[PDB]
Design a protein around this ligand. Structure first.
Ligand SMILES: *P(=O)(O)OCC(C)(C)[C@@H](O)C(=O)NCCC(=O)NCCS
Length: 86
């Protein structure tokens, strides 16, 4: 039927769970605390954590450089890049 919240919104959710676990392992928090709308400032993602997270996302989700991660608002903007890279 009609798209909700968008067309192919479920294809982001398949990648966003892998992103959330990959972020959780980088910052040392429980995986249940992470979610798509969470700001990267609220997760403490400084330059060193971003350089680690880029390598971790390349190993566990899809290839990405830290130059993309410095441009992000939240994990919803990131998963739109990685779902399109596959
Ligand atoms: P990245 O190498 O671009 O930056 C790393 C950083 C630790 C400097 C950055 O993430 C940051 O927190 N910048 C703000 C620093 C600040 O407002 N005051 C100095 C705190 S020691």
């Amino acid at each position: 039927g009609p798209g909700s919240a968008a067309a192919d919104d479920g294809r982001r959710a398949e990648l966003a769970d892998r992103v959330s676990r990959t972020v959780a392992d980088t910052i040392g928090r429980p995986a249940g605390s992470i979610g798509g709308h969470t700001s990267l400032e609220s997760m403490g993602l400084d330059s060193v954590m971003i350089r680690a997270l880029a390598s971790r996302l390349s190993a566990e989700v899809a290839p990405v450089g830290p130059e993309m991660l410095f441009g992000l608002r939240d994990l919803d903007e990131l998963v739109d890049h990685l779902v399109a890279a596959r």
